[PDB]
Ligand binder design. Structure first.
Ligand code: POV
Ligand code: POV
Ligand code: POV
Ligand SMILES: *[C@@H]1O[C@H](CO)[C@@H](O[C@@H]2O[C@H](CO)[C@@H](O)[C@H](O)[C@H]2NC(C)=O)[C@H](O)[C@H]1NC(C)=O
Ligand code: 2J9
Ligand code: 2J9
Ligand code: 2J9
Ligand code: 2J9
Lengths: 446, 446, 446, 446
């Protein structure tokens, strides 16, 4: 009970922050957080007393590189104007050459912030998904396949060659409804569940028409059922999944705090994925390198952007906001340790104490208390939105594309018939003008 | 007539009341309720005259650590001023160190108030939901757009002008089937999947019809698959059935009475489901922790609120309001017993007296007299997920709206023909008289 | 530490049973269960010692009614050849007139065993469920309604009266395809998504045919989508829900242990629901009154049967087996109390101790340890079975019913035409025999 | 050359090995692995000659309460026989009271082995699943049954025999369109929802066709709605993603190594999710608690088993077998550090040496050399729920089976006509030669 320990500590949520009460001027119950509850139960097992003191500089600790002078909390650890440094103070090779750390109470690393997938614009078509792109092409090869087979069988079968003119049938003239043009019009019209004016007689052609109807009915039933599975159970998917999946895409842009501890890892890196990721953000400096953590969260939240901070700050923000999520595992491995001056016997005593706190399972109980906030279980039994112009939206393009295609066929049939009239009339001009008159007669017969 | 014993209660209903009548100078006849009928039937089989005396404080009992003493009824019993605390005095641990109970007369626990689930509001025209109102208009404008294109293409195309009357070679006639009215009827018929009496015969008009068929195949499939998504996710909507269901729940807020025995249970609770319920309450103890029981009942009404109180006071106000419903079982387990001073010779005679009334079935009858009144019809079907008139409903209105509209057109077709029939022969009225009788020949031909 | 307490105890799972180990002959760690863990922590707070002793009779305790001699455990509580009776010993008015109980450590009551619903035979039709029985009748009234409206409009419209014989049309004869027979065949054929040979001209009749197609397309889309909601999310429902819902149905039969503590409640009852339930099982004695608990569980499991035992034994068996479930709440209210001789000071000390064990929340931790076994969470995302003959199964009846109905119409048309021939030929015999010859010509023309 | 320090390991791979070669009389060159490369690079930057010496016991270290002493490496360090326990010696609480660690060189935890999800076996002909094989046969027998009834009814009915050739009044002809072949083609066409070229005209045959239409409307709806149920519930099948997912899970059993640090964590655990995992293990500790790590790997293969061991030994054997997959994150948090005797002057020089290798990026490179080899292709698409050739598949086979069957019928129709054509004029072969050239006129008429 001699010389009560001066704990230096910086303010950062959820580690150490003030308590939301009016109730002024009492002190040392003024703070509340993760690094207060851990520090509380260190003096439960050990024996020491407080005066938690905020750092008078507002930094952690770094090099000045002009005189070697230190800053932050670890400047107070050297000249003994502090005793402990229970705070987010990561263990660093530069730091422990002048102070001493305890064994870590939290494990962390560099990870990725990115917006959670939304499903607002699934694609302008987005209806073509319940069948595979192989299957969408294999049914067009089935339509062109069956109709060529149905054309050959209808020509080489005797009972399809029937007697036309069902008004006075007594003759020798024999026609055939299945041309090549009429054979695709069967296979398209049977596919689209609509039927046609022509229906096969002559059982060899009815087996083709019978088995094409059963092929059709499974396709539309499989398309309707699988689309009913998509719209019921929305399973979203992110574009990115890891660092190498983000090291390739150029549309997303990277991001870290300028002159932070995260970009120092990418500058000093040698791994071929992260050497590419630094060459991105070194050339694009003053565009993707933000100057603070809270400003970098906004650029994920406003623009299309990814952010590289520590994993513990990601695990705190993604429990608060539901816009955001974590992408991939951990890149680096670092640890928060209790700062301690050189030679002090309180290093090994807290080192024993943290392992005592861990085997009982209290740090997991501390972490679940301060990082779990309101919680985001918002994914449930998805509230069904109607199909909109962003959802189906693309059958209106292919409808307009078919109508524009058909006008060019209509002019192509307007000229091919007039060229056939040009075999019986003059060159190009008079046969086309008389043909335009028949629509300007505006009548029904002739 | 040994001592004319003095018995203390607290004015809580249904337990004790004032007998609602005029004409004062009552004795112990001014009281009624559950504990008055319990005190009566305990007096008949044990032989003692009771004099009812309300406690001066009005509190049940608790230790104030200022004086280390009790208040209310348990202070009235330790001072030997009155025995027989026949009241809602719950048997808890700290209250039996001071006084002696009997065995309980009312099984009890902590449960959850919540509002009875109102509505779900399916409404008329709820079939119109799986497509947005932009889509229902755009499909309607597509059917009035494609049929205006197919009218123009089939008029300009030469190959649509074919030879009718399938006799009489080449017949000096040509004919266009696709008029203006016949082209809307193609587009409407293809929209409702049932093909019309006429199909295109030229490749220009078979691309318009062929791409309108693919448009309508997606529209009917997207309507059916989304309606299979709306009806599935509202079949998976389960209401709140337990306190564990409230654990993940965030929108509907919890509640308790301030410094009552209910929130006292949550402070001492080691259950992780119940400790998360206190993590809600220890933070936000200004908007959900309400002051009185009657205030929290009003909070369940005009909020999204779930109040936590004793099971008897839940199951009483659910009998008085059809807007409320107990959800969940019983969280705690406790019971009301009568109160006697420490070392009294009466708690054994009452325990045998209470068990005698339980074997006879009195306590189940003595509840229901003061418990249930004007039993609610409750509207309990709740398996009405079978698309009744409440669900689908509106397609019987628009069918009736279409059949009334068609009668107005049938009169308009009757007048327009009879006006043209009176253009040459008849004047105005005798044309309409012979035409109404023309259609009343009850025959098949002419 | 004088005269170590002789605890009498009967064997019943999960309260007290032997431990599954080979390891013979050590004693008093030999037993393990609920009433061992509670009894363990009674001697943690109090001070006393064991020799747990099994009862030498294998009963709880009852009357002989020929000499008043007791049996079971409570026979040993009277003559002091026991000290405690930590066991499932329910508090009874007959029992406490000779011994003393502590305050209860478990609350229980009479409840209902019954088989969990299965969904194996949902009904032989079972396809008629996604539309309400109002809606199934309202579409037949729509078919008969529209076709009568479509018949009247097609007669009273001029443009429907068109020129027949499209082979040489130059005449004055005018026919009409819409008869009364042909008008139902439109409305049936449009309902069944099949079309017909006849298609309306004359726009007033096309508005009827247009709006009937849109009515049809919503019905089949609503039927397919809601059936896709049933088969995805199976929501089972029991026939019975409470005692009064079981006091009405005769197909289920009741059940309790003969000369048990449960049927004594129904014999002595006065409530109008349970007086009816006793008149069932008093007249049907030796048929529904079983002689043991384990034999009564089998009759629920083999036959269609309900069983009336205590709620704690229901809460133990229904955690073991997934065939079984609990129906309704609790009928009676009883309690397990620690037996104690008269005047013994260990009654009030354990009474304080049980309330000490309860406020800390340990009996809930004891009960969740011994009643939760493997657990039955087996309801999940139901593994879809194909539609079988037990599932759809009833369209094969109405198909055969329609074909048998049509043969009687075919004979009715065979006679009505022959009666029309009988107006031109003789009475009944020769016109019917010549008409039978034309099918025996076995040809196609004439 | 100060002392030529002695360093103790344990033969566990990848950490230390034997260098696989012939030619004995090695020194410390007979070892290789992770901790040999760590000991090398710690020797280069700190300047000490190491002599590797395997520990005599082979155990890591634990207290036997018989003697209260340690064994294995931590006994080798307290006795000052050798320093530098460069080995998988995890930093735990009881091991640092005896010896001193450095700061960790490998982040570690407890995770879950589980077999990689094999198959899901969609197979060819999986479209045939939403109806049972009784139903696919009965619908086929219904189409061959109704069409045999409709052949008999339309032959016997007088009203079906109508006048063909719609000119020439009454024409001395009658005609039945419904032959045997034309009646199957009605029933097949109505089955596949696309109406044929002929419809019934009598009320007897319009009830057969009218009730066959209602039969097929239910069959196509029941096929589509069940297929929307199969494809939904296998889209809701999420694999096991956490230990909390194993908590409700019952079929796939847990596992651990006997008396290891993994099950030691579950005994001390106060987490209700992890305590339920020990409720599995404390009962069934003969079938799931296995003796060695290599035995439990074989249990994951040939069982439904989930083994619990350290995260490094999971992530090593998943690199060696493509049949295995780590599921879940990290349950525990712990780490390997090198071991030094209590109060050694080397643990500070090693901690700076370990942090120097972490800043350079050595420890991420020193893993991957001894960690990853022959990287697995992993078959990772896993969003193939879009009905590919694996899913639907088989309707392309039966379409191809129908088109090959129709060619055999077309030859049979060609021979049966040419045999009847050779019944009167030609003999056998020149009839077939002029008929093949009859169909090769490449025209539309004759
Ligand atoms: C009467 C029936 C006669 C059928 C004869 C057909 C002619 C010959 C055609 C040959 C086609 C050759 C090209 C495709 C190759 C097929 C062979 C094959 O791959 O094996 C397939 C199985 O075999 C089947 O399942 C075939 C099913 C055909 C049924 C369709 C009949 C159409 C009737 C139309 C009626 C129209 C009615 C409507 C009009 C009124 C798939 O096998 P696998 O999975 O790859 O491996 C097998 C291993 N295993 C055995 C352990 C599982
Ligand atoms: C161009 C359109 C002209 C329509 C005139 C129809 C004639 C007149 C017919 C009268 C029918 C009388 C009997 C039924 C009673 C209906 C009135 C009623 O109940 O109100 C309903 C609303 O009103 C509607 O929404 C009606 C919708 C009609 C649309 C159908 C047009 C058919 C076009 C055919 C084209 C075929 C094309 C195919 C062929 C080519 C329901 O209201 P509520 O819920 O009970 O309470 C209202 C309270 N609130 C206001 C706050 C919500
Ligand atoms: C003659 C028979 C023809 C059969 C063709 C078979 C189909 C094969 C065709 C294409 C095969 C698939 C290839 C992939 C497409 C490439 C990308 C693409 O073009 O997408 C484009 C649309 O896509 C279309 O427009 C294609 C449809 C053309 C109309 C087909 C009509 C035929 C109807 C058959 C009738 C049968 C009658 C039978 C008569 C006997 C989208 O690109 P975008 O417009 O730039 O996006 C703008 C988005 N924005 C506005 C939001 C900015
Ligand atoms: C069921 O009816 C009640 C009472 O009409 C609705 O309660 C309203 O709740 C809102 C939300 O707090 C209040 O602002 C209103 O004052 C309440 N009373 C009204 C509108 O009279 C309740 O919302 C209904 N249930 C549902 C699901 O809508
Ligand atoms: O700064 S440390 O004490 N030493 C280095 N390491 C390792 C990456 C293995 C780690 C890994 C996780 C920590 F929490 C601490 C440390
Ligand atoms: O205060 S008690 O007499 N003893 C403690 N408990 C129970 C644990 C069941 C209960 C439960 C219900 C009661 F009515 C009384 C009591
Ligand atoms: O046998 S008791 O001690 N006294 C009577 N009752 C009551 C039904 C009120 C109850 C109710 C529940 C119990 F657990 C015990 C008893
Ligand atoms: O044995 S330690 O040095 N101290 C305790 N823990 C932590 C819970 C953070 C960890 C976690 C990961 C490690 F690598 C080392 C340790």
């Amino acid at each position: 009970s001699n010389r009560s320990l001066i704990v230096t500590t910086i303010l950062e949520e959820p580690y150490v922050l003030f308590k939301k009460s009016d109730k002024p001027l009492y002190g040392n119950d003024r703070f509340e957080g993760y690094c207060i509850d851990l520090l509380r139960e260190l003096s439960t097992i050990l024996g020491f007393t407080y005066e938690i003191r905020l750092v008078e500089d507002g930094k952690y600790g770094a090099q000045d590189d002009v005189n070697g002078q230190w800053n932050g909390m670890v400047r107070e650890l050297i000249d003994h104007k502090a005793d402990l440094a229970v705070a987010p103070l990561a263990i660093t090779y530069v730091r422990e050459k002048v102070i001493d750390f305890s064994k870590p109470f939290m494990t962390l690393g560099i990870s990725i912030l990115y917006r959670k997938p939304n499903g607002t614009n699934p694609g302008v078509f987005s209806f073509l998904n319940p069948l595979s792109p192989d299957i969408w092409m294999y049914v067009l090869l089935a339509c062109l396949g069956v109709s060529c087979v149905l054309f050959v069988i209808a020509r080489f079968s005797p009972y399809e060659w029937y007697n036309p003119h069902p008004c006075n049938p007594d003759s020798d003239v024999v026609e055939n409804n299945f041309t090549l043009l009429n054979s695709f019009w069967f296979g398209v019209g049977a596919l689209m569940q609509q039927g046609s004016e022509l229906m096969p007689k002559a059982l060899s052609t009815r087996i083709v028409g019978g088995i094409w109807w059963f092929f059709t009915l499974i396709i539309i039933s499989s398309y309707t059922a699988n689309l009913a599975a998509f719209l019921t159970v929305e399973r979203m998917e992110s574009p990115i999944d890891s660092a190498d999946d983000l090291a390739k895409q150029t549309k997303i842009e990277y991001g870290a705090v300028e002159d932070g501890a995260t970009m120092t890892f990418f500058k000093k890196s040698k791994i071929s994925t992260y050497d590419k990721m630094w060459a991105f953000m070194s050339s694009r400096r003053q565009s993707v390198l933000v100057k603070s953590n809270e400003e970098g969260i906004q650029r994920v939240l406003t623009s299309d952007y990814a952010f590289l901070m520590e994993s513990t700050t990601i695990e705190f923000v993604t429990q608060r906001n539901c816009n955001l999520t974590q992408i991939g595992g951990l890149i680096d491995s670092k640890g928060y340790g209790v700062g301690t001056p050189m030679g002090s016997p309180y290093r090994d005593k807290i080192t024993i104490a943290i392992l005592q706190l861990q085997e009982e399972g209290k740090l997991h109980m501390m972490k679940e208390k301060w990082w779990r906030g309101n919680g985001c279980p918002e994914e449930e039994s998805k509230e069904a939105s109607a199909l909109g112009v962003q959802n189906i939206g693309g059958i209106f393009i292919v409808l307009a594309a078919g109508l524009v295609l058909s006008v060019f066929v209509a002019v192509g049939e307007f000229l091919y018939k007039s060229k056939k009239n040009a075999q019986l009339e003059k060159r190009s001009f008079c046969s086309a003008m008389v043909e335009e008159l028949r629509m300007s007669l505006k009548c029904q017969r002739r």
